[PDB]
Amino acid sequence: GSSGSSGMMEDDGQPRTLYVGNLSRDVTEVLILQLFSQIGPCKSCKMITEHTSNDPYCFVEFYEHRDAAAALAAMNGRKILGKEVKVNWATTPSSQKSGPSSG
């Protein structure tokens, strides 16, 4: 019911996966884990280079949300190998409940 009141937040499942894009052809799975490791523990990293047209991309999963968020912002548009890498929250359709906002 569209109204103006204090928002609410329920416990569903904090995100622990981030999408890394704009990675240099020199960047590797081990390299990423090294930089991200400095911030927090990395559960697993999968570098995908299926798309050649555009720069490659890799996924970084952390043990906790605090680490993923910290590494995400720290790595978010960070300079690596002379190439700025973009890091954002890897969203998934898994979730059923959907309710965007309006601006």
Residues with Cβ within 8 Å of 47's Cβ and at least 6 positions away in sequence, in order, are 23, 27, 28, 29, 32, 56, 57, 58, 59
CB 95 within 8 A of CB 12: yes
How big is the CA angle at 85 (ends 91 and 12), to the nearest 5 degrees?
20
What experimental approach yielded this model? NMR
CA distances 56 to 14, 17, 38, 83, 95, Å, are 26, 17, 22, 12, 26
CA distance 89 to 43: 16
What is residue 83's three-state secondary structure?
strand
| Amino acid at position 13, single letter | G
CA distance 90 to 15: 8
| Domains of the chain, first to last | 1-103 (3.30.70.330)
CA distance 13 to 65: 9
CA distance 58 to 23: 8
What is residue 55's three-state secondary structure?
coil
